[PDB]
């Protein structure tokens, strides 16, 4: 049971109590992901319009 790094100021204080010692995707890659899904949407919609035109 020890207290360490006790810091006191006007608005409070803080300290540490120890009981026992121990024993990314680039901007380009994000544009591709976004554009890939946009493309898949464009494909599905064209398949709908192709179906409707038939």
């Amino acid at each position: 049971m020890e207290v360490i790094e006790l810091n006191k100021c006007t608005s409070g204080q803080s300290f540490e109590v120890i009981l026992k010692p121990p024993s990314d995707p680039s901007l380009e890659e994000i544009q591709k992901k976004l554009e890939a899904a946009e493309e898949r949407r464009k494909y599905q919609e064209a398949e709908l319009l192709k179906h409707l035109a038939e």
């Binding site: 608005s11 409070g12 803080s14 300290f15 540490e16 109590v17 120890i18 009981l19 026992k20």
Partner: peptide, 10 residues
């Protein structure tokens, strides 16, 4: 480490 860091704001 088995311990606690404590912060007090009055």
């Amino acid at each position: 480490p088995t311990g606690f860091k404590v912060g007090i704001n009055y």
